[PDB]
Amino acid sequence: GAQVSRQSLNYFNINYFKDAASSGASRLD
Amino acid sequence: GAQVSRQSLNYFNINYFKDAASSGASRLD
Amino acid sequence: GAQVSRQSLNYFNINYFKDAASSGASRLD
Amino acid sequence: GAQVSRQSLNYFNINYFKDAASSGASRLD
Amino acid sequence: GAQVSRQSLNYFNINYFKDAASSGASRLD
Amino acid sequence: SDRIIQITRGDSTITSQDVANAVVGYGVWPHYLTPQDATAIDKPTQPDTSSNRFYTLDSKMWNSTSKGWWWKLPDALKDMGIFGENMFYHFLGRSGYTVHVQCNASKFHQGTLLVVMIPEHQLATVNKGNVNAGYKYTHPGEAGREVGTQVENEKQPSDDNWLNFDGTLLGNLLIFPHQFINLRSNNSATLIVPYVNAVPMDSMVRHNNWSLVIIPVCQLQSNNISNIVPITVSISPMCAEFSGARAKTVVQ
Amino acid sequence: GLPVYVTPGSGQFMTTDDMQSPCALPWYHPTKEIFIPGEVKNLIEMCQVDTLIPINSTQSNIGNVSMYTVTLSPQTKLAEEIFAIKVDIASHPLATTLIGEIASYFTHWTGSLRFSFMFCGTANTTLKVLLAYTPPGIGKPRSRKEAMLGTHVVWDVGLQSTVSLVVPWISASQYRFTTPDTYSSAGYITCWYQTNFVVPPNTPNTAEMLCFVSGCKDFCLRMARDTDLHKQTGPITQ
Amino acid sequence: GLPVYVTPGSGQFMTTDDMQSPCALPWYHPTKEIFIPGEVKNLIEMCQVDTLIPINSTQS
Amino acid sequence: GLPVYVTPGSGQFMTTDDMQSPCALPWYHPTKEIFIPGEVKNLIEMCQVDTLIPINSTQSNIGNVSMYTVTLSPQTKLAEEIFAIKVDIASHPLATTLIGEIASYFTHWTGSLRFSFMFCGTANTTLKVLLAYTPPGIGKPRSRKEAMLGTHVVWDVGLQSTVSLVVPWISASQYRFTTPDTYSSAGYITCWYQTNFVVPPNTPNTAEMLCFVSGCKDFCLRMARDTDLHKQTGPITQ
Amino acid sequence: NPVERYVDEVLNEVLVVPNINQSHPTTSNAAPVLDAAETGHTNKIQPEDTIETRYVQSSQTLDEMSVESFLGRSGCIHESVLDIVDNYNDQSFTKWNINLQEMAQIRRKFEMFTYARFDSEITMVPSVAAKDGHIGHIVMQYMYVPPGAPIPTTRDDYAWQSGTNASVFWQHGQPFPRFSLPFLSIASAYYMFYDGYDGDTYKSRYGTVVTNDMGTLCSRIVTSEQLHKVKVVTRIYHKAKHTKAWCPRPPRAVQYSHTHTTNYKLSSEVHNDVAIRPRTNLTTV
Amino acid sequence: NPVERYVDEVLNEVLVVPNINQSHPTTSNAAPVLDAAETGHTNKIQPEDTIETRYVQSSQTLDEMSVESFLGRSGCIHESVLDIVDNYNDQSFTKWNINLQEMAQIRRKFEMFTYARFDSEITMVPSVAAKDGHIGHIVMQYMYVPPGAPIPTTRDDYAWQSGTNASVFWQHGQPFPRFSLPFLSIASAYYMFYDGYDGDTYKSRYGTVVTNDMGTLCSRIVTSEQLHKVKVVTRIYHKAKHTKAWCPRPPRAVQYSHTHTTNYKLSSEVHNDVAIRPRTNLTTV
Amino acid sequence: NPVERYVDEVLNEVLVVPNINQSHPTTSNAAPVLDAAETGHTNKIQPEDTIETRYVQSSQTLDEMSVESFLGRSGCIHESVLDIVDNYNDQSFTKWNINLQEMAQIRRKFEMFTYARFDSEITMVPSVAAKDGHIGHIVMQYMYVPPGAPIPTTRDDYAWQSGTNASVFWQHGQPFPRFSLPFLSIASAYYMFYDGYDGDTYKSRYGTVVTNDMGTLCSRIVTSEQLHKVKVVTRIYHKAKHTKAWCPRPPRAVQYSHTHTTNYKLSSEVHNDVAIRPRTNLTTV
Ligand SMILES: CCCCCCCCCCCCCC(=O)O
Ligand SMILES: CCCCCCCCCCCCCC(=O)O
Ligand SMILES: CCCCCCCCCCCCCC(=O)O
Incomplete structure (x- = not known):
């Protein structure tokens, strides 16, 4: 998945696999 | 093929080969 | 080259090299 | 991160890791 | 750098390094 | 008439009533150095008409056995008036040239001279290992070199006209700015060449930018051989400018 | 990470590939380019310039300017043959001409050829000659x-x-091989006396002729290859 | 650099794969295509043409 | 997965490459940056500052402050020579000056040089000197x-x-090599008595002169390289 | 424009140098060539002021002379040796007190400034020498042990578990390991020099050893003992990134002798200890 | 259109050649076939002027004949040898004064021009020959030493630290190393030929050796001494990129004998020294 | 739609076959089943015309029967052998006159057409057999030598410099080499058959050897001589891409005997030379 943001500073939060366990470290807060 | 969705959470369902047999596991339902 | 199509089902026909001989199998018809 | 510019000459300043120390050499000035 | 063109046949002239000497063969004329 | 030509440079005017048009080396007319291409920062000196004039060299005699002649520029003009003085008082120099080769005979004569202007004519030595042509040999002055005469020496350059004195075939010299003096057609050749180099200005003492090569490709023949047929060369600098003034350099 | 599939060819080094690579001298700024007369952008520019054909390259002439000249003179028999050579751009004696040398760096050629001849006898020497091109077959x-x-x-x-x-x-075909190949041997160019070489009295009874060659507007070379007109049989040292 | 995951199959050579590859003759321009009668685009075209059956193919 | 083609160069380590790499200390927040006087952003800033030339570095003077001074005095012969050195920024005795040391970290140099001289005799000592730059050739x-x-x-x-x-x-060329190379040896700078060193009575009959060097607005260095003005012949231990 | 600045980066024309303008003869009571070095300032005279110059468009750029460029090249800072001679358990692991003081080339460059702040890119080049013929399957472990963390005393020490410390595992045949480290100091910048002590007595330590503790690099051959003995040498390379430097200083003029100190040795003939070459006399070029 | 130009690049139809137009019989006092080679110009006569031609649409393109294409092919310029015979310390490293004069094939192509400007792509092909059986773990270091930089004199010379010079480390089993170099000259273009000296005396050097100093390539086997001796041969390949050339010249007609010089040798029978093949006579094809 | 056509490509439903429609009993003086094969045309009668058919929706597609598909499979065309037996210098290199005539499987498929035009994908599969135990570090060089280019006669021949020819260097352990070649002919299509000669005499050559010269493939083990001898076999695979074919013909019915020729051998019992199996009689299925 690609959680594309915009500001231009575009953020591409990509999830390469189809399972939540596969993603990297979580964000804080 | 790229089945790009939008919500911003963009989904990129990519098919790297030209044969249906090549794609990964099917969706449910 | 990227022959981007739209329908959303986007098609990305990419040619990675600069010579026609380099591309893969031709389309039919 | 992707600092996409536009002019068309698009610039893609990508940061592949989540730490500032990971990026390449700094710009001048 | 990405010199994105449009026609849809999009052209992606990408320069992966930050030095002119690094790019491939020049265009003619 | 297209057979005629008059060339005026400074206080000199040269004429010919039987020319074969004229050649402008690489299609570029000589011009002064621009500030976009310049590197040396001192203001250049431009003698103008006192240096950009025709200087006539020592004449040579063409006979049935002649193998050719060559001169190097600016070396050939090192002792020619104001132009010569300037090339020794300054570290840097820059110039274009109008080369006018003269040779008349008679209509009952026949012969052909290939006149060529070669940029960076780096001469070779033959069967001498890595020993290269000595400074003195590539700086003969207005006397130039008579191919087929010079008594050999170790640092002596090649004298093979068919190998362009550098390991390449004579037949391909035509790729360089050139003309022919075919006695039945013309009695002179005219070549105007611009400054050609990988740097905007250079030492006129240790770098010869152009080389004038004259090879008789068709033997001089007639039924009145006692009449001497000379070849005369007149060269006029163009847009000559110098930089880096100091004392006068003395060679040798 | 992004799933990838390493394709055949990966890791290989093909001398004619066109890839990008990191610069060993980052931040380095090359010397400003200045104008230099005589720039060449395409070798065709060099193929369009006449160079002399060493047409008289018999063993006794090679190594002498005479290998580039053809002698003409008063004939006693009519319609005598003056010279004859193959038209094939990379065959001998055309091989060492500039266009022949460049053609030797390619596998195929096409287009029309321009052969020129300059008479060098006295201005009072007259002559009529017939230059012919014989198509193959x-x-x-x-x-x-x-x-x-x-x-x-x-x-x-x-x-x-x-x-x-x-x-x-x-x-028959759009192109021909530059190297001596039967199927694509382009034919011959011959020269013959149309009338005769004539001169007044007290005039040299022989005269020379120079021969040139270059390519016409339709000339073209294809498929780069190494030349066989030059070799290295030992190390080139300092 | 972009993080990647080399998948099984990588590096293999399958005679029926359909990948792209660098051209050994860059800048080369192929001979112009001319019209030739009799082009075939699909083998079905050949299956639709009658040919004789060697029906009496006894050894003799 | 995405089909990829591994290019030549892959897997290699070039000391001057500019790639990204994972951080060994994730989440680590560096100490806040505070203002510190004297920041330098470009070495050119250091090349523009005068430093003394060890112009009098004869064997007997090296290791003494006197290696930096040139003595002047009343002359009996006119137009005597005071000193002479090469102008080449990385040649000796310019080599160990700050600009010379920095130039020794690069392969090419260009631009104008600024040589300064400070007279250190008494306030009643007068003198006229001629400083000359001799272009090459x-x-x-x-x-x-x-x-x-x-x-x-x-x-x-x-x-x-x-x-x-x-x-x-x-x-002639836009740049010159910093290391001692004939083709690009920039010339000389010499000093001569224009009139003479004169003093009133009861005043020291000799005086010193200090020499400085720095680069002008057009000075520039190019192509980074290791210096030969410093070495390591053994391990540096604790 | 972030795209116009991009073009300047590719062409390396971010920092251009001034042109030389045409000048003319002058006769004035304003003498730019005259000044007073006693002020501590450099005369700002330019070529146009001392000779008649022509107009010249400069094309030179100062990009490569930037601090980022100068210190942004990867150089060797350590050569770790694991030589299996006669005892695998004792010779298959080692440690190194991290510092940039042991290799002259990079040390001298950084020491041309008093303070410097930067992130670090560490690249490792391991090479396995087959002393007996084979190398087998070599797997290495490089662990960064910050000051305070337990230092391993055996090849199977629990500290190798690396439950918190960062460790990099390399497998022979795989590309060279590489990782980035963020500016590590407890201060705002690293001290290239430090005129201070860790106390006020005759026995207090002096210099950068007091302020530059970076911890230890502990290495070990992960692979258990093999029949054939090997000698693994891992060379460590360092490159500064996102750099800032303050207060430039004179370059090191003599060989270094020890780490964290400016100490030096002098022979009986000092001209041999410096790069200065003796001149015959004042007028011999 | 940057997309229409893209299609022409893929199809290699950027530079098209002119068509041949239909011509007809003529009777005129204008004789195109007649000219004067003495002028130094080539007669611009075309086929339509000498025969009756038909109309033909040309499909040929000159793309492949471009200078970029001609000089844009990677060719061998050096074959470095590190042969371990009886002394590892002396035989495990070497150096080469860089130049494009030692291999005939690429040298001749570049020498068809007087000046040339281009960036360079260097590709290295190392091959380790197992003289005794094994190769162990081979790691190579290739360091570019620009003129002036210290040249290593031992395999452990401090210069190998490469604190500023660019070094490429290759590991056996990894892909062939490759990097780009920007146009390196202090001038605007490289001299393929130079009719000048580095002085004005009988002992001054002549030719391109005066202007073409590119520094040195220093190599060494990083791996320390191994039981089994190897012979590592690294072949260097060069390819010009973003090329420009000026003043074409006659191709080299005889074998090269030395670097940076046009010198040549001649035998007693010169026809053996050139590619020209003796003709029986003027009329024997 | 370029996206709807995309879906058909993935599903392989670009070329659909016609449905069968329902038919009914008929009584007419129009007899579709009757025709005249003498015309040289095939009767176009369909099942609906001879029986009473039901309606059936066809789902079959002809995509896989396309010419691109038929000839678009990579098959072996050559098996190059470099067998080190007793002389490395002579046995470490070889050459092959390129052609698609030596392997029956792909040759027969292409020969089902008279002319064919296509680009080629060449894939190489090298395998190093350790005859003495080790293989060391094997690096191969494959050079394409177009007709006319100098052919190497030794393993160190200058031609290996490959200053213009295309060469592919492969390193043992790296993936299989692969590159594309554009349609190479001097004509518009390749001749699968050629009823012509290269002259008009009793000694002129006949067949495709006259028109199909593709040059030579020169190979060599780049690695210098090693202690242990190896046998390197490189198998070459070819696949046609972007294909067009003209004038289909009868398939090869007997074994091939030589390249570029339709020659064949016949035994005393011809039924053994063809795939036809003798029938007992006309009525024995
Ligand atoms: C595994 C080794 C970590 C690599 C070395 C990192 C060095 C960064 C710290 C620089 C501080 C310089 C002060 C000093 O001389 O000690
Ligand atoms: C590690 C080797 C650097 C590779 C070689 C780079 C060559 C580029 C310079 C070309 C200048 C040609 C003049 C000459 O003949 O020396
Ligand atoms: C390194 C080998 C090049 C590989 C082979 C390429 C083959 C393409 C040409 C096809 C022409 C067929 C005619 C024939 O039977 O010879």
Whole structure:
């Protein structure tokens, strides 16, 4: 998945696999 | 093929080969 | 080259090299 | 991160890791 | 750098390094 | 008439009533150095008409056995008036040239001279290992070199006209700015060449930018051989400018 | 990470590939480019310039300027043959001409060729010659009559010293091999006396002729390859 | 650099794969295509043409 | 997965590459940056500052402050030579100056050089000197007359103690090699008595002069390289 | 424009140098060539002021002379050796007190400034020498042990578990390991020099050893003992990134002798200890 | 259109050649076939002027004949040898004064021009020959030493630290190393030929050796001494990119004998020294 | 739609076959089943015309029967052998006159057409057999030598410099080499058959050897001589891409005997030379 943001500073939060366990470290807060 | 969705959470369902047999596991339902 | 199509089902026909001989199998018809 | 510019000459300043120390050499000035 | 063109046949002239000497063969004329 | 030509440079005017048009080396007319291409920062000196004039060299005699002649520029003009003085008082120099080769005979004569202007004519030595042509040999002055005469020496350059004195075939010299003096057609050749180099200005003492090569490709023949047929060369600098003034350099 | 599939060819080094690579001297700024007369952008520019054909390259002439000249003189027999060579751009004696040397760096050629000839006798020497191009599928002409049935130019010597004969591209295939190949041998170019070499009295009874070659507007080379007109049999040292 | 995951199959050579590859003759321009009668685009075209059956193919 | 083609160069380690890499200390927040006077952003800033030339570095002077001074005194012969050195920024004795040391970390240099001289005799000591720059293509001047034909400055000693001679960039090529190379040897800078060193009675009959060097607005270095002005012949231990 | 600045980066034309303008003859009571070095300032005279110059458009750029460029090249800072001679358990692991003081080339460059702040890119080049013929399957472990963390004393020490410390595992045949480290100091910048002590007595330590503790690099051959003995040498390379430097200083003029100290040795003939070459006399070029 | 130009690049139809137009019989006092080679110009006569031609649409393109294409092919310029025979310390490293004069094939192509400007792509092909059986773990270091930089004199010379010079480390089993170099000259273009000296005396050097100093390539086997001796041969390949050339010249007609010089040798029978093949006579094809 | 056509490509439903429609009993003086094969045309009668058919929706597609598909499979065309037996210098290199005539499987498929035009994908599969135990470090060089280019006669021949020819260097352990070649002919299509000669005499050559010269493939083990001898076999695979074919013909019915020729051998019992199996009689299925 690609959680594309915009500001231009575009953020591409990509999830390469189809399972939540596969993603990297979580964000804080 | 790229089945790009939008919500911003963009989904990129990519098919790297030209044969249906090549794609990964099917969706449910 | 990227022959981007739209329908959303986007098609990305990419040619990675600069010579026609380099591309893969031709389309039919 | 992707600092996409536009002019068309698009610039893609990508940061592949989540730490500032990971990026390449700094710009001048 | 990405010199994105449009026609849809999009052209992606990408320069992966930050030095002119690094790019491939020049265009003619 | 297209057979005629008059060339005026400074206080000199040269004429010919039987020319074969004229050649402008690489299609570029000589011009002064621009500030976009310049590197040396001192203001250049431009003698103008006192240096950009025709200087006539020592004449040579063409006979049935002649193998050719060559001169190097600016070396050939090192002792020619104001132009010569300037090339020794300054570290840097820059110039274009109008080369006018003269040779008349008679209509009952026949012969052909290939006149060529070669940029960076780096001469070779033959069967001498890595020993290269000595400074003195590539700086003969207005006397130039008579191919087929010079008594050999170790640092002596090649004298093979068919190998362009550098390991390449004579037949391909035509790729360089050139003309022919075919006695039945013309009695002179005219070549105007611009400054050609990988740097905007250079030492006129240790770098010869152009080389004038004259090879008789068709033997001089007639039924009145006692009449001497000379070849005369007149060269006029163009847009000559110098930089880096100091004392006068003395060679040798 | 992004799933990838390493394709065949990966890791190989092909001398003609066109990839990008990191610069060993980052931040380095090359010397400003200055204007230099004589820039060349395409080798075709060099193929369009005449260079001399060492047409008289017999063993006794090689190593002498005479290998570039053809002698003409008063004939006692009519319609005598002056010279004959193959038209093939990379064959001998055309091989060492500039266009022949460049053609030797390619595998295929096409287009029309321009052969020029400059008479160098006295201004009072007259002559008419027949330059002929014999398309393939037949042997070289054995006589002037046989030769003139093909493509030709009758050259009259006069105030203008040079004449040109164009060898048109007459081929079954769009291209031909540059190296000596039967199937694609382009034919011959021969020269014959049309009338005779004539001079007044007290005038040299022989004269020379120079021969040139270059390519016409349709000339073109294809498929780069190493040349066989130059070699290295030992180390080139310092 | 972009994090990647080399998948099984990588580096293999399958005679029926359909990948792209660098051209050994860059800048080369192929001979112009001319019209030739009789082009075939699909083998079905050949299956639709009658041919004789060697029906009496006894050894003799 | 995405089909990829591994290019030549992959897996190699080039000390001058500019790639990204994972951080060994994730989440780590560096110490806040505070203001510190004296920040340097470009080495050119250091090349523009004068440093002393160890011009009098004869064997007997090295290891002593006297290696930085040149002695002047009343002359009995006119137009005597005071000193002479090469102008080449990385040659000796310029090599160990700050600009010379920095130039030794690069392969090429260009631009004009600024040489300054401060007279250190008594306030009642007078003198006129001629500082000359001799462009290349000739040997160093053998006399004042020969030297003044080139670029020069006639320095009159007075209330203002220091004078500057600029060695303009006079070269065939846009750049020169920093290491001692014939083709690109920039010339010489010599010093001669223009009049004479004069003092009233009861005043020291000799005086010192200090010499400085720095680069002008057009000075520039290129192509980073390791220096040969410093070495390591053994392990540096704890 | 972030795209116009991009073009300047590719062409390396971010920092251009001034042109030389045409000048003319002058006769004035304003004498730029005259000044006073006593002020501590450099005369700002330019070529146009001392000779008649022509107009010249400069094309040179100062990009490569930037601090980022100068210190942004990867150089060797350590050569770790694991030589299996006669005892695998004792010779298959080692440690190194991290510092940039042991290799002259990079040390001298950084020491041309008093303070410097930067992130670090560490690249490792391991090479396995087959002393007996084979190398087998070599797997290495490089662990960064910050000051305070337990230092391993055996090849199977629990500290190798690396439950918190960062460890990099390399497998022979795989590309060279590489990782980035963020500016590590407890201060705002690293001290290239430090005129201070860790106390006020005759026995207090002096210099950068007091302020530059970076911890230890502990290495070990992960692979258990093999029949054939090997000698693994891992060379460590360092490159500064996102750099800032303050207060430039004179370059090191003599060989270094020890780490964290400016100490030096002098022979009986000092001209041999410096790069200065003796001149015959004042007028011999 | 940057997309229409893209299609022409893929199809290699950027530079098209002119068509041949239909011509007809003529009778005129204008004789195109006649000219004067003495002028130094080539007669511009075309086929339509000498015969009756038909109309033909040309499909040929000159793309492949471009200078970029001609000089844009990677060719061998050096074959470095590190042969371990009896002394590892002396035989495990070497150096080469860089130049494009030692291999005939690429040298001749570049020498068809007087000046040339281009960036360079260097590709290295190392091959380790197992003289005794094994190769162990081979790691190579290739360091570019620009003129002036210290040249290593031992395999452990401090210069190998490469604190500023660019070094490429290759590991056996990894892909071939490759990097780009920007146009390196202090001038605007490289001299393929130079009719000048580095002085004005009988002992001054002549030719391109005066202007073409590119520094040195220093190599060494990083791996320390191994039981089994190897012979590592690294072949260097060069390819010009973003090329420009000026003043074409006659191709080299005889074998090269030395670097930076046009010198040649001649035998007693010169026809053996050139590619020209003796003709029986003027009329024997 | 370029996206709807995309879906058909993935599903392989670009070329659909016609449905069968329902038919009914008929009584007419129009007899579709009757025709005349003498015309040289095939009767176009369909099942609906001879029986009473039901309606059936066809789902079959002809995509896989396309010419691109038929000839678009990579097959072996050559098996190059470099067998080190007793002389490395002579046995470490070889050459092959390129052609698609030596392997029956792909040759027969292409020969089902008279002319064919296509680009080629060449894939190489090298395998190093350790005859003495080790293989060391094997690096191969494959050079394409177009007709006319100098052919190497030794393993160190200058031609291996490959200053212009294309060469592919492969390193043992790296993936299989692969590159594309554009349609190479001097004509518009390749001749699968050629009823012509290269002259008009009793000694002129006949067949495709006259028109199909593709040059030579020169190979060599780049690695210098090693202690242990190896046998390197490189198998070459070819696949046609972007294909067009003209004038289909009868399939090869007997074994091939030589390249570029339709020659064949016949035994005393011809039924053994063809795939036809003798029938007992006309009525024995
Ligand atoms: C595994 C080794 C970590 C690599 C070395 C990192 C060095 C960064 C710290 C620089 C501080 C310089 C002060 C000093 O001389 O000690
Ligand atoms: C590690 C080797 C650097 C590779 C070689 C780079 C060559 C580029 C310079 C070309 C200049 C040609 C002049 C000459 O003949 O020396
Ligand atoms: C390194 C080998 C090049 C690989 C082979 C390429 C083959 C393409 C040409 C096809 C022409 C068929 C005619 C024939 O039977 O010879």
